[PDB]
Amino acid sequence: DRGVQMLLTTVGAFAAFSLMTIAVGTDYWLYSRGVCEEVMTHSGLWRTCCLEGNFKGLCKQIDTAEYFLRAVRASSIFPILSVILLFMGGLCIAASEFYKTRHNIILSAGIFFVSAGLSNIIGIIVYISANAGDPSKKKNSYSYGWSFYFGALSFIIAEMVGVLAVHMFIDRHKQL
Amino acid sequence: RGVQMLLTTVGAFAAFSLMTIAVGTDYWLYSRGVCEEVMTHSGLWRTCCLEGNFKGLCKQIDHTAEYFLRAVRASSIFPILSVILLFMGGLCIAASEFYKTRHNIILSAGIFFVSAGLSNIIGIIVYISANAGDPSKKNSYSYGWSFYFGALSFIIAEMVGVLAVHMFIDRHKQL
Amino acid sequence: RTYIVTTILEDPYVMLKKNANQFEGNDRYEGYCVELAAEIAKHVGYSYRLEIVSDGKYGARDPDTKAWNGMVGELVYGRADVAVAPLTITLVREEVIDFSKPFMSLGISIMIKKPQKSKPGVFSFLDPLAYEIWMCIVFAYIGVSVVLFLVSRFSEFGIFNSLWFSLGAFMQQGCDISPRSLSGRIVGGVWWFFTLIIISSYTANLAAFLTVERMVSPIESAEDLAKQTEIAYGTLEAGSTKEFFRRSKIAVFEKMWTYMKSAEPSVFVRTTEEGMIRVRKSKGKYAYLLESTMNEYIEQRKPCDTMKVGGNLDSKGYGIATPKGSALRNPVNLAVLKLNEQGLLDKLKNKWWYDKGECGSGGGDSKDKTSALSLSNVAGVFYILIGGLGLAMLVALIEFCYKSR
Amino acid sequence: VVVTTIMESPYVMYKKNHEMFEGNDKYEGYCVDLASEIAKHIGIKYKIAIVPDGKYGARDADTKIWNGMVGELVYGKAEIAIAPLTITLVREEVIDFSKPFMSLGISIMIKKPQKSKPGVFSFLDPLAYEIWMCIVFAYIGVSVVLFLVSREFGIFNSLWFSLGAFMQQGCDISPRSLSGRIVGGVWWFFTLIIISSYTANLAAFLTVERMVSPIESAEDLAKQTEIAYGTLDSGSTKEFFRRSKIAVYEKMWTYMRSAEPSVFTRTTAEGVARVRKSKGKFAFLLESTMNEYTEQRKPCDTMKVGGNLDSKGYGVATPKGSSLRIPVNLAVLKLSEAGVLDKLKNKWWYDKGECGPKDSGSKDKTSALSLSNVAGVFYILVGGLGLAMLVALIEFCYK
Amino acid sequence: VVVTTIMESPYVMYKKNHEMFEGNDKYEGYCVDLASEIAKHIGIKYKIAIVPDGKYGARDADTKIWNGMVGELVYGKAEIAIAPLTITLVREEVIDFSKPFMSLGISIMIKKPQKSKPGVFSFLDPLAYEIWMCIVFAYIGVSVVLFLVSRFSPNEFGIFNSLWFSLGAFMQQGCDISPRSLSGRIVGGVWWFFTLIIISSYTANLAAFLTVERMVSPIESAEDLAKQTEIAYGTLDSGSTKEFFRRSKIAVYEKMWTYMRSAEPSVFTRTTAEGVARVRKSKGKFAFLLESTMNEYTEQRKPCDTMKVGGNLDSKGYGVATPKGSSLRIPVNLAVLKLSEAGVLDKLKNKWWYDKGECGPKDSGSKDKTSALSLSNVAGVFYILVGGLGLAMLVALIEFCYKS
Amino acid sequence: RTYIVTTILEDPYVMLKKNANQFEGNDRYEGYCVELAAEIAKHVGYSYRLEIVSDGKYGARDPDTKAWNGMVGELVYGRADVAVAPLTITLVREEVIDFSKPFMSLGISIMIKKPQKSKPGVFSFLDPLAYEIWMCIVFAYIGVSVVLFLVSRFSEFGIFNSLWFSLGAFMQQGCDISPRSLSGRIVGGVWWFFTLIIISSYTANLAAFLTVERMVSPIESAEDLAKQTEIAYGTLEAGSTKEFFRRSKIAVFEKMWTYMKSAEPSVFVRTTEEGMIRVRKSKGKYAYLLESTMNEYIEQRKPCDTMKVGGNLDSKGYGIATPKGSALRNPVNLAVLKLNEQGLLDKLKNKWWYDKGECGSGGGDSKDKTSALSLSNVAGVFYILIGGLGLAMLVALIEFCYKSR
Ligand SMILES: O=c1[nH]c2cc(C(F)(F)F)c(N3CCOCC3)cc2n(CP(=O)(O)O)c1=O
Ligand SMILES: O=c1[nH]c2cc(C(F)(F)F)c(N3CCOCC3)cc2n(CP(=O)(O)O)c1=O
Ligand SMILES: O=c1[nH]c2cc(C(F)(F)F)c(N3CCOCC3)cc2n(CP(=O)(O)O)c1=O
C-alpha cells in the first residue's frame, strides 16, 4: 500500500502549489476594517486594494533587533523564500516520480517541506506581529479573511505531506 | 550488628529524657503576654509568670471540625496520646533490650515511633494554630527550646526508627 | 355639612381604576393617598369627595404677578380646605399656608443602571490569552511534533511516539520517552523552555485579569460619585433639585455642582420618563438624581433594571395642607400623628409599594456575592474535556474497528 | 429667654475649661449651636440651663403630671426647649411641635466584620464545593474509561496513572493506543488549566483580602439568621415592638420571646460592653442618632448601619398659647431648607470624629502567610497519612 | 479709560460669533476678569479696545517706534494696559512694571507615550537584567560540577547527557535516568529547588508587572535631556527662548547651544503651532521647549497628549504697565499686590485654567482597561522558539554533513 | 559719600566668618545676599558698610501699641540707606515703602523623608511565607520520607531511594521509581496533592506581595497629601504659612486647614531646626511645609535623608527695601532687573547652592527605576545553591575516602 500514498503526496503538494499561487496572486488575506473610517479591504502580501470608498478603483503596492524584521515585512522575504523552495520541492518530487532510482532526492524533498513549514510560520508570525503588533489599531478589527485560513490550510497540508513523505523516507530507508 | 541496637537504646532513652523535660516541665515558648510584656512558661497543667506586679505566683492553667481542633488544642489529647504511645514504645524497647527473641514488639515499636512522631508534630501544629491560627491580636512564635525538644522528638525519633527499619530489613533476612 | 378634597395625579397616587369609567367616580381610585384620605376621613368624620385639579401641576410661588396655583393655589383662593395629595415642604408654602405633619421622611436619591452580566462558557476559557495565539501555538505544537519525528528517525520514535512525546512536552507532564541524538535533545529543550514561558504567561495574565476584574467596586454615596468622572450624573432644570444644588454651600455639594455646571454633553433632560429611558438606552454611565419615593417606584417596574444605592442626601418631608383658623387643623394633626405612631402608614406603604409591584417580589434575589470561580467560568473546559473524552470514545470505536474489522 | 437641657451625650457637655465661664458660654455641641442659630435667626437674648429633674420628658400616667421638660413647660417653669424631643401621640395635646429638623429611626448595629480563620474551609476557599465534587466525579469517570479502553492498566494501575496526572507528575508505563493518547492528553490539559485557574483565583483573593458584610444586612436576613439579637428593657423601641402590623416584626417579637431572657439590657453602656466582647453575640436594633454617635467614638471597630427601619421625628417643643410658635416654626423650616443645620450636623458628626478611616478606605500589609490559612493543608496531610497507615495495618491483617 | 489686550492668547475669547453682549464687555478670560477685579478694587471704567499691531511688542531701535501695547502706551493713546507682557530691561526703562501676578518659566515638553511593544526585550522585560547571564553561568557551573560528580565516582552520563539532565530538571518536567548516587542527591535536589523557586518568582513577577502599569516617563529633567542625546530638541526660530539660549552662562547651556548649533532636521521652527503639531504627529523626536503658561494651556487642549516634567529653566513674569508716574500707578500697584496676597487671584487663575479643559478632569490615571496579551508581549518567546528550532535543524544538518 | 547696607543673620543666606577675627570689617559675611550686595554695589556704584539689625528679626507692620521693629522698621526710622536682605512681598510693608523687583520665587512646599529600604539576602528569600511554615514543610518532608521508606519496605526500596522519590514527589520533578502497592500509591497521592497546594499557595503569596509592593502611591503635590490622611503635617504657630492657612480660600486648602485645625497631633514644632529634627526622627510619619529655599538648603547641606516633592503651592516674590523718597530707588531697580534677566544672578544662586553642598543628589546620577528584581531577593537562592553544591562535592570525596580506607 504505497501507490495511493505517492498519489496523496502528489495531490497534497499540488494543493500546496495552488495555495501558494492563490496567496501570491490574489489578496484575500484579511478582512480588515481599513480606510478607503472602517470598511472592508483586500490587503495582500503583494497587492493591497479596496472595494468601497470615494477612490475605489485605484490601488498600489504595500512597500538592533527590529530593523531586520521590518525589512522582512516590507519585502515579504520569508514568504518569497517559502514559495521558491516550495516550487523547488515540486520540481524535485516531479523528478522523483520520474526518477525512482535515486534516494537523496526525497531527502531534499523532505527538507524543502519542513523548511516550507518553518518559513510559512515565520512569515505569518511577522505578518501578524506587524498586523496585531501595532497598538494604535479601530472600533472593528480582527476577523481574519479567507486566505489567512488558506495559509493555515497550506501549513496543515504541509504538515500532512511532511508526515507522509517522511514516512516514504522511513519505509524506503528500511527498504534501503 | 550491636552498634544498631545500642543506637536504638541511646535514641530511645534520649527521646524519653527530652519528652520528660519538654512536656513534664513548662518550658515551651517565650512570649510578651500579660500576667504587660512578660515572659511566660506554659506547659500542660500550670503556667508560670516571671516578672510584673504578680511576681512569685505560678497559676494553674485550664483548657464540625472546629470543635474537634479546639478540643485537641486545649486538652492536648494528641500530645497525650503521643506521650502515652511512646511510653509504651519505651516499655517495649526495655523488653527488646531484655528479650532479644520477640519479633512483634520491636517492629510494633517502630510503628510506635513513627506514629508518635506524627502525633507530636500535629500536636505542635495544633498548639501553634491555637497560638497563630487563633492570633488574638515578631517574637510571639518564639520556641523556648522545648518546641525544639519536640523537633528532636520528631527528627531523632525518625533517625532511630529508620535505623531500626535498617535493622528490620536485615532482620527479615535474619529470620 | 359636606367636605371636599383636592388631589394631584402623577405616580402612583391617584391612579385611575383598571375598569375605566364604569365606576361611580372618586371611589375608582387605587393608590396611597386615596386610601390615606379614606382612612383619615373615617378617623375624624368628613366627606372625601375628590376635586379635579385645575392645571395638574403642584404649583409654585410664581414671583411674576404674584398669586398661586396647584393645590395650594386652590386652597388660598377659596373652595378648597383639605389637600391629601403629598407635596414637599418649602419656605413659600409655609409663608402662605401651614402644614400638619410629614407622613414620611424622604430625600433626594441616586440611582444607577442595574449591573447585568453573563459569564460565558468556552469563551471564558480562551478569554485571558486571545484567540490567534492558541491557533498558532497548536500549529507550532504539531510542527514540532512532525519535525521531532524527522530528527528522531533521521539520524523506535515513530510518528505516534513523537506525537506522544511532543504532547507530554507541550505542557509539562513527563514521559518515559527520551531522545538520544543531540539535535533531538536540543529541540526538546527549546520546546520545553518555550512552553514553560507560555504557561507562566497564561497564569500571570489570568491572575492579573481576575485581580483587575474584582478590584473594581460598585458606586455608592456622594463622595465616591464626586470622585468618579466616568459614571456621569445630572439633574433636570425645571425642578427643586437644581435649586437645592445651587443654593447649597457645603463643600461636596458645591463640588459636584461645579462639576455639572460645565456640562458639555446634553446632560439635562425635560421629563422624568425621558431621563429614565435615556438611562435605559445608555445603561453604562448616567444619573438623574431623582427623589427617593420615585426611585423606589421605578425600582419595582416590569423592565426590572433600576435599583437604589446610597442614602438620603437631604431631609425633605411631605405633608397635608390645611387653611388658617379652620376647625379641621388640630384634629387632622392628631389623626396623622396617630396614624404615624400606629404603624398603619407603614402597612399601607408596604402594601402599595412592595406587595402590588409586578417586579421585585423577592427583592433579595442575588445577595450571596460569591467571589469565587463558580461553574459559570471554567465549566466550558469540563465540556471540551468530556467532549475530548467523547472524541476519545469515537476514536476508540474506530480503532476498535482497526482491531475488529 | 431661658432654655432647659438634659445632660445627654450628643447635644450638650460640660466643657473641660469649667472655670472659663459660668452661665451661657459653658457648653459646646449640636444643641447649643442650633439654639444660637435660631436665636440669631429670630432675634432674642438666649441662655442655657440644665433640667433639675434629670428626666427626658414623659408622663407618669398616674399623678396626672409629666416628668421632665414638658412637665416643667406645662406647669410654668420654661418657655422654650431647644433640646431634642421625639414626637409621639401623648406629647401633642399638651405641647406644640414644629417641623422635623432631623430624621431618625430604628436601625441595626452589629460587631466588626473581620476575616475568618477557618480550618478546613481555608483549604477550599478558592473555587467551590460543586466544582470539586464535579472534578472527583470526572476523575472517577476518566479513570474507569481509560481502564476499560485498554482492555497493563488494571483497576489500580489506571487509578495511579490518573492520580499521577492529577497533580502534574509522570508515570512509568505509557499506553500505545490512539484513544489512550487522546484521553491522556485531554486529562493532562484539563489538569493544568484547572491548577492555573486555582492559583490565579488564590493569588487574586490573597492580594485583595477584601472584606464582605456579614449575613446581618437586612431585616429578612436578620430574621433568617441564627445570631442573637438584643435591645433595651423599656422605651421607644419596646413600645414599638409591643404592637406591630407588619408580621415580620411579629416574627422578631416571637424570636425575642422564645430566646434566652439575656436579650434585655439595662443601659446602653452595658449593652455596648456586652456586644464588644464577641464578634457575634447579640446585635442591636437601636436609635440612628445613638448609632451615629457610637460609630465615631474612640473605639472605631463597630461602625455598621445596615438597613433602615421605622420613621420618627425630632422637633422643638413650644408651650401652648405662645406667640413665638409660628416664629420658631418658620425659623427651623428656613434653617432646614436653606442649609446650615445640615452643615452643622456634618461638621459635628462626620468631621468631628476620632478616626477618619470610615470615610475613605485604606490598604493593609499582606504580611506573612502565617499558619491559619495553611493548617488545613497539614490537617488533610495527617488525615491522608493516618488513613494510609490504617489501611496498611488492615492489609497486613488481611493478607 | 482705555485698556488693551491681545486676542492671540489664552486670556480672551470671542463671545459666540458676533453681536453677542453688545456694548463694552464682550470677551471672557483670565486677564479681563483680573482687570474687572482690580477695577472693583480701585474704581475705573473698562474698555475692550485692541491695538491692531498684532505683535506683543519689540524694541525696534532702527525705527525708534515700539509696536503694539507698549508703543500705544509710551506714545500715548491710553493709561492702563493689562496683558501677557514679559519684563526685561528695554521695556522697563520707558515703562515701569508692577509686581508679577503669576510665576513664569521655560520648560521642555515631550509627547505622551502610548505603549511599549518590544521583541526579545518583551521577554527580557520582567525580572532584572543581569539574571539571565547569571542563570546561564550558574547552569554551566552546576552542569560541569555534577558531571564531575558523576565521572569521579567509579557514571552513565556524559557532558551532553549531564547537560540535558540539568536542563530537564531546570524545565520542571523530569528526565530518563536519575544519577542514583548518594552524592548526587544533594546537588539534584538543590538544583530542583533552584529551578522551582525561579519559575515561581518569574510567574509572580510577570503577574505583578501585568496587573498594573505605571509607565515611567522617558525624561525627567533638563540635565538628563542634555545627557541622553536621543530625542531631537528645538526651541523656535527666534524669540525670547532663542535669545536666552544664544547668550546663556550656566555651564550645561553652552553645551546645549552647541547641540542646537549642529541642527540637521531644522529644529528652528517658524511658528509655535507648527512645532506643537509636529511634536503631536511624531513622539520619537522633535520634543519642544516653551514657556510654562502656554505649556499648561496646551495641557488642557483637545488632543490631550502632552505633559511637563517639572523644573523651571528661567524665571520671569507678566506685569501690568502704566505710562509714567501718576495717581493710577501706585493705585494699580497696590491693587495688584492686594489681590496677589489674597487668595482670590490664584483661585481665579487655577479655576479658569482647570475648568475649560476636559483633558485634566480625569486626574492621575484610569484603571478601566484590562485588554489581553497580544503577540507583542509574546512574539519574543515565539521568535526564540522558532530560532531554536531553526538552529536545531541547522545543527542536525551539519551533524549529517560531519557524520555522513 | 558712604552708604550703609543692613543684613539679617539668616541661616541659608549668610554665613558668619569661620576665620572670624583675623579677617574682619567688610569681609565678615559670606553668602548669597552679601555677594548680591557687592555685585549691585559694583554695578550701580557706591560703598557698602555692613550693619546688623538690633532685634535680629524680620519684623512686621502690625498695628500694635507702637514699638515697631524689624528691617522695614530700620528703614523707616531713617537710620538706613538700602536693605539688601530677604523680604517677602506683602501689604503691611508696602504701605510705607516699596520693594524693587522679585529676583527669586517663593512657594510653600512639603518635604518628606527619603524612603530607603535595603533589600536583604536570605532574609528576603523566605519572606513571603512564615518561618513556622518552612519548618513544618521540612519536618513534613522528612516524616513523609521515612514513612514512605517504611511502607515501601513493609509492602526493592532503600532509604536513599525513598529520599530520592520523596524529593522528586514533593518537588514536582519526575523520576524513574514508582510506589508499588496501593498503600504506597495513596501515600504518594497525598504527598503530591500536599506539595502542589503548598507551591500554589506560595506562588500566590509572593505574587500578592509583589502586587501590593508595586501598587503603591508616592506622595505628589498637595492633593495626594490631603487625601492620604496617614502622615501628619503642620507648620509654625506664626509666619507666612500660618497667615496663608488662616486666609485660605481654595476648597482643598480649606480642607487641609480644617484637618490641621482638628489638632489631633497639633503643630508639634517651635523652631525650624526642632521640626527638622522631629521629622527626621519620625521615620516618615511626619510632614512639614516650608519655604522652598530652606528645602533646597536642607536637601544638600543637611544629611541626605529629607527630599523635596511637589511644586510651589503659591507664587510670592522677593525684593530689597528702598526708601520712598530717595535717589537710590530707580537705578537699583534697573540693576537688579538687569541681573535677573542676564542670568548672573542665577549663576550666583547655582554656585552658592549646588557646588558647596554636602550631598550627592544633584552632583551625581540617581537610581533608574527599571522595576522587576535587582539580584537582591534571589541572592540567597544561588547562595544556598552553591552551598549544597559544595556539600555534595565534599560528601562525594568522603565517600571516596571510605573507598581509599
Ligand atoms: O410639592 C411638590 N412636590 C413634588 C413632588 C414630585 C414627585 F417626586 F414626583 F412626587 C415632583 N416630581 C419631581 C420629579 O419630576 C416630576 C415631578 C415634583 C414636585 N414639585 C415640583 P418641583 O419643584 O419640580 O420639585 C413640588 O412642588
Ligand atoms: O421620646 C423619647 N425619645 C428618646 C430619645 C432618646 C435618644 F436616643 F437619645 F434620642 C432617648 N435616649 C435613649 C438612650 O438613652 C438616652 C436617652 C430616650 C428617649 N425617650 C426615653 P424612653 O421612654 O426610654 O424611650 C423618649 O421617651
Ligand atoms: O513681552 C512679551 N511677552 C510675550 C508673551 C508671550 C506669551 F505669553 F507666551 F504669549 C509670547 N508668546 C511667545 C510664543 O508664541 C506666542 C507668544 C511672546 C511674548 N513676547 C514676544 P518674544 O520676544 O518672542 O517672547 C514679548 O515680547
Residue numbers in the entry:
A (entry chain F): 5 to 40, 55 to 81, 93 to 166, 170 to 208
B (entry chain H): 6 to 40, 55 to 82, 93 to 166, 171 to 208
C (entry chain A), F (entry chain C): 389 to 543, 566 to 815
D (entry chain D): 397 to 547, 572 to 819
E (entry chain B): 397 to 550, 571 to 820
What did the study's authors say about this model?
AMPA-type ionotropic glutamate receptors (AMPARs) are integral to fast excitatory synaptic transmission and have vital roles in synaptic plasticity, motor coordination, learning and memory. AMPARs are tetrameric assemblies composed of subunits GluA1 to GluA4 and exhibit a modular architecture comprising three layers: the extracellular N-terminal domain (ATD), the extracellular ligand-binding domain (LBD) and the transmembrane domain (TMD). Here, to determine the subunit composition, physiological architecture and gating mechanisms of CP-AMPARs, we visualize these receptors, immunoaffinity purified from rat cerebella, and resolve their structures using cryo-electron microscopy (cryo-EM). Our results indicate that the predominant assembly consists of GluA1 and GluA4 subunits, with the GluA4 subunit occupying the B and D positions, and auxiliary subunits, including transmembrane AMPAR regulatory proteins (TARPs) located at the B′ and D′ positions, and cornichon homologues (CNIHs) or TARPs located at the A′ and C′ positions.
Additionally, particles in class 1 with the subunits at the B and D positions were untagged by a scFv or Fab domain and thus are GluA4, in accordance with the biochemistry results. We categorize class 1 as A1A4A1A4 receptors, using a previously defined nomenclature. However, owing to a limited number of particles, we cannot further classify this group. In these complexes, TARPs are consistently found in the B′ and D′ positions, whereas there is greater auxiliary subunit heterogeneity at the A′ and C′ positions, similar to our native CP-AMPAR structures. We infer that TARPs preferentially occupy B′ and D′ positions because these sites provide ample space for its extracellular domain, which promotes stronger interactions with receptors than CNIHs.
